[PDB]
């Protein structure tokens, strides 16, 4: 192998996916304000 150029040992970057959404969206919250029962 005269030329040893990286082919498999690539950098792996993980894209985030978890979210902490706020009950019903602000659109729904402004229309239907939340009351805790």
């Amino acid at each position: 192998n005269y030329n040893e150029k990286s082919q498999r040992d690539f950098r792996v970057v993980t894209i985030g996916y978890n979210l902490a959404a706020s009950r019903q969206d602000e659109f729904a919250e402004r229309i239907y304000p939340t009351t805790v029962i």
Partner: protein, 142 residues
């Protein structure tokens, strides 16, 4: 009344404009919490900041269950307001605070206006000269 719900209920009362709403919403949470959390006497600023931010982020996690707040922006504001508070307790206290809390009538603007017209030193530059011209005295005595 969980803190996340009570803070959200109150924040809903801010006037709305449009997308600028997240900048003023985040700012108010940063202002209230950064100034409300007590400091622990055994900590230096470095540790007090790490502890205060840890609680601030936990508060946002609870608030974000009710009302949307930009987490990274709110922390940006929180750290800036907290540093101001830390500076005031170790550093110089603005005369507007002595005035606001305590016959005090002539204000700083009143002298900064004259200095600006004559293009001379303002209140803050004079204050810097005072301490500097006093550095030797205080260091010499105890």
């Amino acid at each position: 009344q969980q803190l996340g719900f009570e803070l959200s209920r109150i924040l809903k009362q801010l006037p709305n404009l449009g997308g600028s709403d997240r900048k003023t919403r985040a700012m108010l949470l940063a202002n209230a919490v950064a100034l409300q959390i007590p400091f622990e006497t055994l900590l230096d600023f470095d540790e007090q900041q790490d502890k205060a931010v840890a609680k601030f982020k936990k508060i946002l996690s609870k608030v974000n269950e009710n009302i949307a707040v930009d987490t990274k922006l709110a922390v940006t504001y929180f750290n800036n307001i907290l540093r101001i508070r830390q500076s005031l307790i170790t550093g110089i206290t603005d005369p507007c605070l002595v005035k606001a809390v305590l016959n005090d009538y002539l204000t700083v603007d009143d002298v900064n206006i004259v200095s600006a017209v004559v293009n001379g030193p303002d209140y803050n530059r004079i204050q810097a000269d005072m301490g500097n011209a006093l550095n030797q005295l205080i260091g010499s005595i105890d």
